Design a protein around this nucleic acid. Structure first.
Ligand SMILES: [Mg+2]
Ligand SMILES: [Zn+2]
Ligand SMILES: [Zn+2]
Ligand SMILES: [Zn+2]
Lengths: 49, 240, 115, 67, 52, 49, 258, 96, 46, 49, 329, 34, 48
RNA sequence: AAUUAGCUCUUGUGUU
């Protein structure tokens, strides 16, 4: 073990990868959510390029 | 360090001495109202009910102040504090014993702001002397500052999200100073360029140009309807 | 937050009078009727009826502020005809007209409903 | 989110015509013909159905917080 | 005071049928915060009836 | 017309934007190369005689 | 110095709208009649809602607002109910209100369309407009969602809230041919003829009449379904007359004291 | 316009007749690319539409090139406001 | 005495005494929602 | 920020199809914060071997 | 509607409309932005006229009856968070209803609104200066309970209880509040024509067409010429065509198949004036207006800058500690 | 064959295909994946 | 007050119809644009 | 009657 790296949503290593609309709706996740952000301490953070 | 504490902006000299935060202030959105005289501002009920003006009890005005103290702080045209002459103050939000509600001559009553009170009305990018003018208060239902449009030019106001500040003078001397120096009608002509700063703007100007054309004719009904709106009318219908 | 209740537009409270008369002092035979909790619905019809009367020199009305619910009607009549008389006659004429229109509408509907 | 009960402008009841409108659209009617077949003359009412998105159908896809 | 914090209902007047909570009250009137509107009003206790 | 026809029936058989790139019809141009290129805003308007 | 004699002529009357023409009256009276149509015609609508259990996807105030807008058939009760401000009773009695109860529970998998037929009135003469085409949709429910509530409907007119507005559309119009020049067309040939235009296809507007007044006002009053349109018109006339008579009484009591 | 309430002759001319030449720093649109303003033109083109002249009016709509050029012309106003406010504030404070 | 919550996943109400770990008897879930109040709520349909 | 420079804030000719020519903050940071065009892509990087 | 599953998220400062509408006239680009699935704004019957003088300078006149029928009505959620934690050996916060005889520092705040858990319950009406979470820390105990923000006056939408990473109790409470479009609220078209509501008139007072069509929003003409938003006028014109014909209009930026002339020719086929003008009748007097008024459906939005979130006043409030001057904010 | 004046439909079919293949936040997801 | 009350009768508006030319002015504008384009083309030719 | 720093975002001044 080294440490924990946060994962931006809908990445290839995110749990919401390849899941269908029904799959996300069963998870209380909006299928229209673009992903593309991190969740740090329960807050949604985004990196400005 | 100590130098940083008073160096420049936000330091002691510029952030606490040349300019400070003040009591008896209000800040809301402004909206138009063409039914107000140019020296009036309409304030909502809650803002008036929250700010107080201290008034000295005298035999001339002891009955009215007694009634105001009776109304308490709940109903709007009431008072908030009653100050004895020995500095002691009584709060009217705690429904104290009626013996305390009794007031004599040398007392002060902090009554809610009512119609006719003098306030300084300001817009924050204060450039010239016409950005801090004095108005008379009028209480109005909804929750926005309302002001006649002729004065939107000195303030450079816009009615599209603009906010303006209201300061309530707290003493008779200060109120008299505002009334005698900085009332709106006294600032019509500016010393900057010896020309008016308030004029006729927008659709009032458009309609006055369309209204004084040669071929504009009015029948008696519409003439009477218009004459209903002259405050200075002498009641004599002109010969057609 | 500062929203007035809706019924404020048409409900009077304690100490509030429906109509008040004041004698205008600028000219003789003129009066100001200050009606509370009314709007253009009554002002316009009363003004028009007063304008029909040939003994009324002036008849106008106004609403001082759209957020305060009252109107002022100014009526100036010729001498030997008090403006109060003109006002009450105008009201009676409106009542007569409305009753006549109501009965004629009833008759016309009855005719239409049976071919 | 759901069909308004009344047209915002005139007040005509338009809240009972959403299902009929969808059915007429599915029955191979142009949107204009579907709207005028439901007795919506003034365009104020027409915009109420023509320019409405039914969002509650998606909202129903989530499981209830309580059961 | 007994009335403070009691769920009350207005029994008379243009506000008939509304429920609310008494925040501050006196021997003559009371202040009722309304459940349905975001406003607190003043009403005489004689039009007020305790609920529950 | 072949590309537009195959792409109109997309999301049914297999065919997508990536295959459109693969046939060498569209191309990724960056701003540095964009100096040496010469664009036509619209085909019919700016390529006829 | 006296009133004129208007005349009425209906050109169409259905269960939804009435088209008629009023003649020989002032514009002020006609416009006041229109505004009374829209504003001051007493009608019954839901105005008190208590929710015992809600688990739908809409918050409670959303549901209350949707309920308030539902039209209720109130043709003869409005004349018999009293205003809640006027009834000398504690809590709504049947003489000043009507009670509705709703209780819907969706157990089966298919979604439930909670509609206007789910409202159960305690008075047979005041029901939503489903007496005898789909229903006013209120909510959609999933499995395991329920909605239980009880409401009171009372009398009011449109000057308070638009839920008490009886009319759906009032099409007031006078002088279809611009003979009075009350509006000035920069180019009359670009303007379509009115529905009531007694003018040939050649010309665009009637010649100017220097001595003329607005006459022959055309109304097309379309009801929302609560009151029948002729009942709307009659109630409006009665209400206008009542307002004027009450004003006269108050003026008499003021004049006798001055 | 003639009432003086709002607008001016240039506003009417731009709405009806033509928007006109765009300018940045008092000059025509500079050659951001090598010897051309946009890739759609040929190198060393000093013609009107190449260097930032809008020949359409606001009613007819702007073609894409002149739309971009008009955006360039409009950006300088916001930039100038953002710098001028802070530049004049210190002037006025020192005068006071 | 005990307070009633509702679980996030299993949606089964459980009585949980004060000063107890926030957990569900089944599904060991960690998100609990409080239940609706019992006092009457009155909305005007305005 | 708080810089007297005005060249970086301006709309360069090279931002055609790359950066939106209209979306920018109006505050103290006008022209320094921008947004991508609709079809803009950003290269992720690859080895040149 | 910022996200479909907004009823699950415990965000701070969530706004959501009641009846968001798909735009009547749309650009082909927004199909891929999912704007038709999560729209933000309503098509409203906008008339460009100087009616009374309450819309003169970038102000608008709103139809009161429309607002009563749910026009632009919205709802505002606000979420609070609070967890009990072990401050130290002698200091330990805990959720519990304060008692009038065990806590030394106690104001006149009412604690009976929240139940014996120390938490408010869903459906309970709350207002400013009302405690929501009953939290006390031992000294015998001092108050540390949270309060609703001053001048909010909402209804508790939902309450959630869980554990943080280190296993302490932790509650998040979402409070909702319905906002009605009162005067002072801010509205904007899609072409930068922002303004605040000046006054609201009922359907009876607003001007009307030959039929009973009355504007929802009346804007001043003077907003147009100096700003030259001709796109606003063209969108208004094609809104009528889209509404009558029964199909969503196209406003793709560079089309050349759509111009004002063709739109006018289409409009004149539905019995209207080809330039979109109509004859309006004065609302108060019923008289015609000598100038035909431009009117049509246009898309408007409700910006989040509501007046009730900005109104502020002070008279001898709290004070700072360093320099005894009135606080900030 | 060439596509004359039936081009707006083709012009938007290709764009729709592009936006189906790659979303609107493709750069961020691709960068983090890499 | 007086002018704002008379505007209730007179009215005021602005629309698409206030931005249209009489289709003879459009010809003049197009001709002037073509003349200017020819002029600048000629000047560039002389510089060439 | 319970705190200060820092950072970010946003509003009005962008009239001509
Ligand atoms: Mg402004
Ligand atoms: Zn409608
Ligand atoms: Zn009763
Ligand atoms: Zn569980």
């Amino acid at each position: 073990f080294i440490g924990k790296i946060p994962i931006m949503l809908r990445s290839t290593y995110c749990l919401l990868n390849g899941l269908t609309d029904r799959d996300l709706c069963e998870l209380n996740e909006c299928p229209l959510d673009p992903g593309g952000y991190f969740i740090i301490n329960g807050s949604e953070k985004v990196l400005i390029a | 360090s100590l130098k940083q504490r008073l160096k420049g902006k936000e330091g002691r000299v510029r952030g606490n001495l040349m300019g400070k935060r003040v009591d008896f202030s209000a800040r809301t959105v402004i909206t138009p109202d063409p039914n107000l005289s140019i020296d009036q501002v309409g304030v909502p009920r809650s803002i008036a009910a929250n700010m107080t003006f201290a008034e000295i009890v005298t035999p001339f005005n002891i009955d009215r102040l007694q009634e105001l103290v009776r109304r308490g702080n709940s109903q709007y045209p009431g008072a908030k504090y009653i100050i004895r002459d020995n500095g002691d103050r009584i709060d009217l939000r705690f429904h104290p014993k009626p013996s305390d509600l009794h007031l004599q001559t040398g007392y002060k009553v902090e009554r809610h702001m009512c119609d006719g009170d003098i306030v300084i009305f300001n817009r924050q990018p204060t450039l010239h002397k016409m950005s801090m003018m004095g108005h008379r208060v009028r209480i109005l239902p909804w929750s926005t500052f309302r002001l006649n449009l002729s004065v939107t030019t000195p303030y450079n106001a816009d009615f599209d999200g603009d906010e303006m500040n209201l300061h309530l003078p707290q003493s008779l001397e200060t109120r008299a100073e505002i009334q005698e120096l900085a009332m709106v009608p006294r600032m019509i002509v500016t010393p900057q360029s010896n020309r008016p700063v308030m004029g006729i703007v927008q659709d009032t100007l458009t309609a006055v140009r369309k209204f004084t054309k040669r071929d504009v004719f009015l029948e008696r009904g519409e003439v009477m309807n218009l004459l209903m709106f002259l405050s200075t009318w002498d009641g004599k219908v002109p010969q057609p | 937050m500062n929203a007035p209740p809706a019924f404020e537009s048409f409900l009077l409270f304690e100490g509030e009078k429906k109509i008040t008369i004041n004698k205008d002092t600028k000219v003789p035979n003129a009066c100001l009727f200050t009606i509370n909790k009314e709007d253009h619905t009554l002002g316009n019809i009363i003004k028009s009826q007063l304008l029909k009367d040939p003994q009324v020199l002036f008849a106008g009305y106004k609403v001082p502020h759209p957020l305060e619910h009252k109107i002022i009607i100014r009526v100036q009549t010729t001498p030997d005809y008090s403006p109060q008389e003109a006002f009450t006659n105008a009201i009676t004429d409106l009542i007569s007209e409305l009753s006549l229109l109501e009965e004629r509408f009833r008759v016309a509907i009855k005719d239409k409903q049976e071919g | 989110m759901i069909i308004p009960v009344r047209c915002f402008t005139c007040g005509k009841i338009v809240g009972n015509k959403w299902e009929a409108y969808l059915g007429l659209l599915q029955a191979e009617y142009t949107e204009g013909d579907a709207l005028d077949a439901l007795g919506l003359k003034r365009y104020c009412c027409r915009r109420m159905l023509l320019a409405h998105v039914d969002l509650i159908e998606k909202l129903l896809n989530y499981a209830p917080l309580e059961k | 005071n007994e009335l403070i914090g009691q769920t009350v209902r207005i029994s008379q007047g243009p506000y008939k049928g509304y429920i609310g909570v008494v925040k501050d009250a006196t021997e003559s009137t009371a202040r009722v915060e309304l459940h349905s509107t975001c406003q607190t009003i003043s009403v005489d206790r004689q039009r007020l009836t305790t609920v529950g | 017309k072949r590309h537009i026809d195959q792409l109109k029936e997309r999301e049914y058989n297999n065919y997508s934007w990536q295959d459109l790139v693969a046939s060498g019809v569209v191309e990724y141009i960056d701003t540095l190369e964009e100096e040496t290129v010469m664009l036509a805003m619209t085909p019919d308007d700016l390529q006829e005689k | 110095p006296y009133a004129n004699q208007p005349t009425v002529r209906i050109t169409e009357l259905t269960d939804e709208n009435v088209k008629f023409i009023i003649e020989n009256t002032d514009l002020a009276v006609a416009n006041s009649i229109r505004r009374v149509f829209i504003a001051e015609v007493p009608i019954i609508a839901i105005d008190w809602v208590q929710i015992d259990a809600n688990s739908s996807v809409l918050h409670d105030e959303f549901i209350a607002h949707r309920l308030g807008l539902i039209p209720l058939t109130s043709d003869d009760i409005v004349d018999k109910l009293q205003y809640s401000r006027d009834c000398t009773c504690e809590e709504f009695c049947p003489e000043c209100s009507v009670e509705f109860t709703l209780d819907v529970r969706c157990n089966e998998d298919q979604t439930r369309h909670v509609t206007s037929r789910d409202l159960i009135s305690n008075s047979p003469r005041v029901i939503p407009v489903t007496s005898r085409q789909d229903d006013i949709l209120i909510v959609k429910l999933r499995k395991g969602q329920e909605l239980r509530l009880r409401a009171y409907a009372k009398k009011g007119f449109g000057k308070e809230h638009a839920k008490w507005n009886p009319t759906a559309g009032v099409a007031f119009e006078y002088d279809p041919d611009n003979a009075l020049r009350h509006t000035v067309y920069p180019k009359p040939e670009e303007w379509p003829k009115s529905e009531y235009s007694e003018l040939d296809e050649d010309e665009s507007q009637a010649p100017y009449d220097p001595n003329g007044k607005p006459e022959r006002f055309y109304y097309n009053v379309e009801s929302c379904g609560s009151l029948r349109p002729e009942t709307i018109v009659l109630s409006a006339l009665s209400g206008l007359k009542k307002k004027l008579s009450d004003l006269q009484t108050q003026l008499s009591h003021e004049i006798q004291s001055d | 316009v003639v009432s003086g309430a709002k607008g001016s002759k240039i506003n009417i001319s731009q709405v009806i007749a033509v928007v006109g030449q765009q300018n940045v720093e008092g000059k025509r649109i500079p050659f951001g690319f090598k010897h051309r303003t946009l890739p759609h033109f040929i190198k060393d083109d000093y013609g009107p539409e190449s260097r930032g002249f809008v020949e359409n009016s606001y009613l007819a709509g702007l073609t894409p090139t002149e739309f971009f050029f008009h955006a360039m012309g409009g950006r300088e106003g916001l930039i100038d406001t953002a710098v001028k406010t802070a530049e004049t504030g210190y002037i006025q404070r020192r005068l006071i | 005495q005990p307070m009633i919550y509702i679980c996030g996943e299993c949606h089964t109400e459980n009585e949980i005494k004060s000063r107890d770990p926030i957990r569900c008897r089944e599904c060991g879930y960690r998100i609990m929602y409080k239940k609706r109040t019992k006092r009457l709520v009155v909305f005007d349909a305005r | 920020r708080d810089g007297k420079l005005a060249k970086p804030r301006q709309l360069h000719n090279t931002l055609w199809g790359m950066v939106c020519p209209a979306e920018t903050p109006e505050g103290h940071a006008v022209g320094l914060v921008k947004n991508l065009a609709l079809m803009a892509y950003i290269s992720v990087g690859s080895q040149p071997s | 509607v910022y996200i479909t599953n907004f009823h699950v998220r415990m965000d701070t400062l969530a706004h959501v409309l009641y009846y968001p509408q798909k735009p009547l006239v749309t650009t082909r680009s927004m199909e891929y932005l999912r704007f038709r699935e999560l729209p933000a704004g309503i098509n409203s019957i906008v008339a460009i006229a100087s009616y009374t003088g309450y819309n003169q300078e970038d102000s608008v006149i709103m139809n009161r009856s429309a607002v009563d029928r749910g026009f632009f009505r919205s709802v505002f959620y606000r979420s609070y968070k609070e967890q009990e934690s072990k401050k130290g050996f002698d200091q330990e916060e805990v959720f519990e209803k304060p008692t009038r005889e065990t806590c030394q520092g106690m104001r006149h705040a009412i604690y009976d609104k929240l139940d014996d858990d120390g938490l408010i319950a869903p459906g309970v009406r709350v207002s400013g200066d009302d405690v929501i979470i009953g939290k006390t820390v031992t000294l015998t105990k001092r108050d540390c309970s949270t309060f609703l923000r001053t001048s909010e006056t909402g209804i508790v939408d939902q309450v959630m209880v869980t554990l943080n990473q280190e296993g302490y109790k932790f509650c998040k409470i979402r409070v909702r509040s319905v906002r009605i479009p009162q005067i002072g609220d801010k509205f904007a078209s899609r072409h930068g024509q922002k303004g605040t509501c000046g006054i609201q008139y009922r359907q009876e007072d607003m001007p009307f067409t030959c039929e009973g069509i009355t504007p929802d929003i009346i804007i001043n003409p003077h907003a147009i010429p100096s700003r030259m938003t001709i796109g606003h006028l063209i969108e208004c014109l094609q809104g009528k065509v889209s509404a009558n014909k029964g199909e969503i209009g196209d406003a793709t930026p560079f089309n050349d198949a759509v111009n004002v002339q063709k739109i006018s020719n289409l409009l004149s086929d539905y019995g209207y004036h080809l330039r979109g003008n109509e004859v309006l009748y004065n609302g108060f007097t019923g008289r015609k207006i000598t100038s035909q008024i431009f009117i049509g459906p246009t898309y408007y939005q409700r910006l989040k800058h509501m007046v009730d979130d900005k109104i502020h006043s002070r008279a001898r409030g709290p004070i700072q500690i360093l320099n005894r001057q009135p606080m900030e904010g | 064959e060439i596509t004359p004046d039936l081009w707006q439909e083709a012009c938007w079919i290709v764009i729709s295909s592009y936006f189906d293949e790659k979303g609107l936040v493709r750069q961020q997801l691709d960068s983090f994946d890499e | 007050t007086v002018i704002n009350n008379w505007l209730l009768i007179e009215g005021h508006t602005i629309g698409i119809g206030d931005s249209i030319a009489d289709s003879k002015t459009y010809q003049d504008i197009q001709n002037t644009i073509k003349k200017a384009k020819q002029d600048v083309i000629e000047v560039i030719e002389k510089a060439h």
